[PDB]
Design a protein around this ligand. Structure first.
Ligand SMILES: CCCCCCCCO[C@@H]1O[C@H](CO)[C@@H](O)[C@H](O)[C@H]1O
Ligand SMILES: CCCCCCCCO[C@@H]1O[C@H](CO)[C@@H](O)[C@H](O)[C@H]1O
Ligand SMILES: CCCCCCCCO[C@@H]1O[C@H](CO)[C@@H](O)[C@H](O)[C@H]1O
Ligand SMILES: CCCCCCCCO[C@@H]1O[C@H](CO)[C@@H](O)[C@H](O)[C@H]1O
Ligand SMILES: CCCCCCCCO[C@@H]1O[C@H](CO)[C@@H](O)[C@H](O)[C@H]1O
Ligand SMILES: CCCCCCCCO[C@@H]1O[C@H](CO)[C@@H](O)[C@H](O)[C@H]1O
Ligand SMILES: *[C@@H]1O[C@H](CO)[C@@H](O)[C@H](O)[C@H]1NC(C)=O
Ligand SMILES: *[C@@H]1O[C@H](CO)[C@@H](O)[C@H](O)[C@H]1NC(C)=O
Ligand SMILES: *[C@@H]1O[C@H](CO)[C@@H](O)[C@H](O)[C@H]1NC(C)=O
Ligand SMILES: *[C@@H]1O[C@H](CO)[C@@H](O)[C@H](O)[C@H]1NC(C)=O
Ligand SMILES: *[C@@H]1O[C@H](CO)[C@@H](O)[C@H](O)[C@H]1NC(C)=O
Ligand SMILES: *[C@@H]1O[C@H](CO)[C@@H](O)[C@H](O)[C@H]1NC(C)=O
Ligand SMILES: [Ca+2]
Ligand SMILES: [Ca+2]
Ligand SMILES: [Ca+2]
Lengths: 554, 554, 554
């Protein structure tokens, strides 16, 4: 309440709720994260606003459902995949960094943004962190990917199938069949037809080889503020470089209230580790990455102690969504983390998709060793930090998040989230209703993703499930659950609360009905126009030839 | 004589007469085959009707010289090389399986057929085993080949030279020369000429890469009856899978007279072995394959003993032709077996080409431990088994084979084969005359194959010798031998029997003359029309894309 | 003086003056070369006439500056790089081999020529050793190169950049950009434009792959006299094969005065060694090659002792120019030798480029253990050997070399080289003035090569420095040195001899002025016409197809 503490918000990438020690895992070392939970409050029902990166991060920055800002797609691509695309967090949205910057906070983003970069010109930076309330940025504008690390697979394999391999197999089989029919004297094949087929194969293959050659340097690079500093990105000491930049930022601000958003690349695939962590872990390179990340967190923690800032710094730890079930190396090396008890994971709205770790420590104000089981959202951070900074909330627009501090301080027992809505990109997937004066958590599913292998935990054919069409199965009436009684979501409710369906579904359907009546009519940041590679947007660190390449970090 | 015993005919692929233990080899373990010879009769002059697979097997199935059925080519290709080709054992030919099936035998083929599959439509199966007297088929329609096993060479290298590498070298050298002449100002080369050359190179290379990609799955696959069960064929436990199918067939017929043809893939190249045999042998992976094959034979033998069928089962063991001398890995790893004393081998009519093991066991009727040195043919099985089954011989056509049982039972001392003819595919290579009341074996050569390396045992330039033109050398007068005196064929007769040439060559030339007067005028199953790949004949096990691929065996 | 001794001239390739034991190196074993220096005279200021192979060897053969014979280029290519090019030592030049052959010497060249081969027809051999005074030739017509040994790099990388990789990157980026603009609806791209781009890429790549495939066999091959004997050249026992041919030549001439030029392939890159030398050395495969070369020299030395020819054989040892500083494996493996104290090296006119070992032994006439510090040239051999053979010098043309024997015999104290000129290919680089009755060595630089990495010893961007344009920096006034006081050339003279510049530069500039007034107007053996690959000049040892390939040595 206008006391202006320092604020550090830490976001892991695809860390599952079953990964940290303090959430039940007995073999992953996260001693510094569980230190945070033991010294503070550990949220038990903390819900990301989407099970994919870009929309979850949009909602975290704005305190607003991603559909309110057109940051959720209608197509299969739910996150930005090219740095040189025009979609991004709209210029008229207000982040908590801007709210806090307007109150005199020093603001910095270290690590992953994934909310766009430029719009019309490669230097307008309309969606860049520095245009969205951050005074300093060190990190990457897009995301880590398999493709960013050579010999680690590709997130584009499904796409290569429709657009490259299958057309090229049709052309090739047509050419071989025509040549045989010609040779057997069943068909005169004009050379023009052979020419057309060879020409088409050569064009498809050239485009494909161009994509293979250029994607990593054009899309996997490090920036400081508006400049490229390493292209392609090096994984050498990556996490340590992020740690040093975050520690240095804090040291520049020991007498100035500051806001640090520390947005790790871990543990999104293309897993990696320094020499100090490699090989020595529970579940493969995944474990080394998880606990390299915990090391980095401890380094920041030890800094605040050394600098005597720990008592009046609020620290929040989360991941943007749950771990990715379908993430399996071609050699079967099991990447992706654990969501523990809960079903599903990244890219669906089963509990393992959206229930993420949520830890808050603020030693001066928040009682240590607490545990909040009430439903909270990662959109709640926006109003929490705004009030703490003395920044008024925006009054020209809806804010879906709710201040956490009355709950964190014991002034309140039940959170201000009687209804929450679970979107699958742009499509309303599930409604959550934790009724008042009640303990149960009603959860209806307008649809469910068709898990690709039988009985399997995920959608291993398309690597992620989708939200619409052939990949999904609608349910009428809505398909109801009680998350209070079974977290594992392993039995769909019907015989128990049957004398209650139509009365409680009507109050949940009206909530959705009332809800989608506040959704206005906004540009789609994921339209083809805004998703596709635009040559004039491509940032290219000057090198020899037309090559994009430098290591100004070195 | 209408006693209807069970009948098992076992055919190895390219097993040389110098390979089995019971034929003199002191380092290959064939304990189950030599068991057969010790319990039965071991033929010393058993002669395949051709030194190549397809015609030898045609003659074995029909009891008839391959030229009688148009199953011998005039070109360099002597065996079928594509499953989707229309040549095959003609529909009007009668196999011993059909003769025996018409007497109520249960009939089965396990393993290699190599006598065609379909004619006009991919499902007419006009040449398939089930249309030629077999009630059940488990195996492959074509043959094992180097190309069926990845990283094992190719039988098509000679062909790649004429059709791919040499044209592509001409185009490439023309293009480089033209570019230099253009650049030096000696010749204006229109872009159309460069375009034509590049276009032609691209087309040749695409066709070649298509062949490299598709040949194995389109031609190396397992079938049961009319259905593909594994495509491409897996070599995992291959011989054991064949053993189980053959044992199961016998077990379905313990009270029904049955005919099992067991036609191994061993020891034709693409050699292979289970884990139980790999590495532990005499002469490389060849030895492991030979004695894996002997293991399989012992398993059938032990079955008949367990089931109490051994006493009234006739068993025959042979290979389709002699071992392949010219079969040498690129790394020099010596594949192909041994023909021992005899000269030549697979694809020529020297003794090592056509003299093959021939073992018969029938404990109730055939005295154990016997040894027949009289000339016999692998065409003799057809009338042997027909009489045993009570099936009358076809009387509308010539049968060249002769019942073996009077000889096997000691009722006769000299076989009914005063003259035999040795074809090199469609061309009469050699005449054999074992005169009556005589011991010598006169063998004339109308021509001989030009062994490619000097003094070498085979034709290592084209991998096999041929039967016509540049690869051969005619001889007038016919070039005479006495196989009784030297098996090694190491000295051509002239000074010894010189006062006998013109009198005995005239009686052998009249035999050939009389012989080729019975050869009628028949379709060529090896014409280009019938040898070449026809797209509409291609069996393709349904998979994703246009790919031919399944493992319904699994 | 018409005593007709035998004469052996030994030339290493790129052996630096800091490599032999007898010149100060304490870790390279050259026991047979330093034996030569201990038994004879070791020249301290022996200067190659050029720091590149072809012109240095031209000047050695003719006793004449390379510009006098048009054997120095104006372009970046300073040596012949194709056997099938028409440039070469002009037919009107006279070598010392021809002078000596005309006096009745038996003459032989063993090893590297690098002065051309044929002119208009592949069999005119207008520039071949046998047309330039040698009666016998065993060796290579061009040079050893990285490209002659597979997996050893390429001397053409810079060229691949301008002519292949950069054009192909422009075409590829244009194609990818056009495809994206077309796809985004900003530009209709006609198929003709895509076709043109693909066609151009295919042509560039075909030419490049043709160069990669054909360069080694077409340019790296062994000859005896006018015939190819091994194509491509084998490195197996290469140095030993050269040793045997040189020893055999001597043995054919134990009673006939003979001239042996033994021109090693060592130690030019594509380094190599027999089994007897591999792995056991100071500075890598370079050391093994250097001391394999010393072994070969000892073998010739021991021969003359065995044959009792050592006392009246004059032996000379040198290398054609200094070691190559910029020669570094891609894996950083340090190839190229050491120039010791002196600056620069191969392809520049700093002292390390042109100051080479120079050893003479002639036990009957030359006092052992001597050391000549006077400036001498590798052009001095021509008149030395001519007088020894009784051959008169050519009187229709200038000879720049000067007989060494008055100096070697102690009849004279100062050499006849008051002025020498240091050419960078065709461009006068430096003037050397060792004034008379003086000890200092004045050296002016009209220009200097711009060493590519900062402070680096060489020009590592273009692998060698050049002589003109962007790679060089002119100096007015000429940039003066005193080589007597500092060999390392590490301080440019100005404050010391400042009251002497304009008076001594005017006498050195007049020397150059007077000098270039004797340079006549001659064909350029390095014109594009004479450097470029001509298809009709290509020697091709007959093989299968259009392939150039044989091992008649075997
Ligand atoms: C005629 C139809 C062509 C459509 C091709 C669209 C071009 C796709 O653009 C791709 O985007 C990536 C940029 O990050 C790059 O790696 C590749 O250069 C590029 O091929
Ligand atoms: C300094 C920020 C970028 C300005 C440089 C503009 C030129 C960008 O050049 C880019 O190079 C890429 C591969 O080399 C291509 O794939 C892109 O089409 C091209 O736009
Ligand atoms: C214009 C001249 C073209 C003649 C090419 C003949 C096509 C050869 O057909 C080949 O047969 C095999 C089928 O088993 C396949 O592996 C290949 O698809 C195919 O290229
Ligand atoms: C089920 C028995 C076959 C019916 C399927 C008909 C389609 C066969 O498709 C075949 O695919 C091959 C490679 O994919 C091509 O090389 C052949 O030209 C093509 O005929
Ligand atoms: C239209 C412009 C084309 C110019 C290409 C010049 C051809 C270069 O000639 C090259 O020389 C080498 C001979 O030793 C060979 O290895 C290659 O065959 C050849 O490509
Ligand atoms: C015997 C001396 C040479 C006579 C043979 C003339 C034919 C030379 O053929 C050469 O083959 C090379 C690659 O194969 C090509 O690159 C050359 O353009 C071509 O001229
Ligand atoms: C923080 O609070 C604890 C407990 O009240 C105290 O021991 C510690 O010294 C405080 N640190 C600072 C920097 O005030
Ligand atoms: C703990 O994490 C590992 C991998 O990070 C996972 O395999 C395991 O299932 C997790 N624990 C539980 C109880 O799920
Ligand atoms: C087969 O014959 C042998 C010897 O006559 C006998 O020992 C054996 O029991 C017989 N087997 C059967 C199944 O009749
Ligand atoms: C026995 O077989 C091996 C290979 O199978 C062969 O090398 C050997 O020559 C054979 N024995 C005789 C006597 O030929
Ligand atoms: C060479 O000279 C030395 C010393 O004068 C002598 O010992 C040796 O025998 C001579 N050799 C010949 C071959 O004359
Ligand atoms: C001796 O030679 C080696 C390599 O041949 C070189 O590294 C070293 O510098 C040389 N010695 C001196 C004193 O330069
Ligand atoms: Ca994520
Ligand atoms: Ca065979
Ligand atoms: Ca040199």
């Amino acid at each position: 309440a206008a006391s202006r503490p320092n604020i550090i918000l830490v976001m892991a990438d695809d860390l599952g709720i079953g990964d940290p020690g303090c959430y039940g895992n007995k073999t992953i070392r996260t001693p510094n994260i569980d230190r945070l939970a033991s010294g503070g409050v550990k949220l038990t029902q903390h819900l990301a606003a989407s099970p994919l990166a870009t929309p979850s991060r949009a909602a975290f920055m704005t305190g607003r459902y991603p559909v309110r800002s057109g940051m959720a797609s209608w197509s299969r691509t739910g996150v930005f995949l090219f740095t040189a695309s025009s979609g991004g967090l709209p210029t008229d949205e207000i982040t908590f960094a801007k709210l806090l910057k307007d109150q005199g906070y020093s603001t910095a983003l270290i690590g992953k943004w994934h909310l766009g970069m430029s719009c019309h010109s490669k230097t307008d930076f309309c969606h860049h962190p520095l245009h969205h309330g951050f005074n300093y940025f060190y990190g990457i504008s897009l995301t880590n990917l398999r493709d960013c690390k050579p010999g680690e697979g590709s997130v584009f394999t499904t796409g290569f199938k429709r657009l490259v391999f299958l057309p090229l197999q049709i052309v090739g089989v047509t050419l071989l069949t025509l040549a045989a029919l010609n040779c057997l004297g069943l068909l005169h094949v004009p050379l023009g037809v052979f020419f057309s087929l060879l020409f088409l194969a050569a064009l498809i293959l050239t485009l494909f080889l161009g994509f293979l050659h250029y994607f990593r340097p054009l899309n996997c690079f490090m920036m400081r503020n508006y400049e490229i500093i390493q292209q392609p990105m090096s994984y050498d000491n990556l996490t340590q470089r992020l740690t040093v930049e975050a520690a240095q930022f804090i040291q520049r601000n020991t007498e100035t209230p500051f806001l640090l958003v520390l947005s790790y690349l871990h543990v999104h695939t293309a897993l990696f580790s320094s020499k100090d962590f490699a090989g020595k872990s529970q579940h493969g390179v995944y474990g080394d990455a998880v606990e390299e990340m915990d090391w980095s967190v401890g380094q920041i923690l030890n800094l605040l102690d050394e600098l005597r800032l720990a008592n009046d710094t609020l620290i929040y730890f989360t991941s943007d969504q749950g771990a990715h079930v379908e993430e399996v190396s071609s050699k079967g090396e099991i990447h992706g983390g654990s969501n523990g008890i809960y079903k599903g994971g990244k890219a669906n709205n089963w509990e393992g998709g959206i229930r993420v770790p949520g830890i808050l420590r603020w030693p001066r104000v928040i009682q240590a060793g607490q545990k909040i089981d009430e439903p909270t959202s990662n959109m709640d951070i926006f109003p929490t930090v705004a009030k703490l900074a003395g920044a008024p909330l925006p009054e020209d627009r809806i804010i879906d998040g709710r201040d956490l501090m009355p709950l964190l301080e014991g002034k309140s027992q039940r959170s201000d989230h009687e209804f929450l809505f679970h979107y699958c990109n742009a499509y309303l997937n599930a409604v959550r209703w934790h009724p008042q004066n009640s303990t149960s958590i009603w959860k209806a599913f307008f649809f469910t993703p068709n898990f690709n292998p039988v009985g399997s935990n995920g959608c291993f054919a398309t690597h992620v499930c989708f939200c619409f069409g052939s990949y999904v199965t609608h349910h009428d009436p809505p398909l109801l659950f009680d998350i209070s009684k079974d977290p594992r979501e392993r039995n769909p409710l019907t015989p128990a609360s049957e004398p209650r369906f139509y009365e409680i579904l009507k109050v949940m359907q009206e909530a959705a009905d009332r809800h989608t009546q506040t959704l206005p009519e906004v540009p789609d940041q994921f339209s083809w126009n805004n998703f596709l590679w635009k040559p004039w947007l491509q940032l290219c660190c000057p090198s020899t030839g037309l090559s994009c390449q430098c290591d100004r970090e070195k």
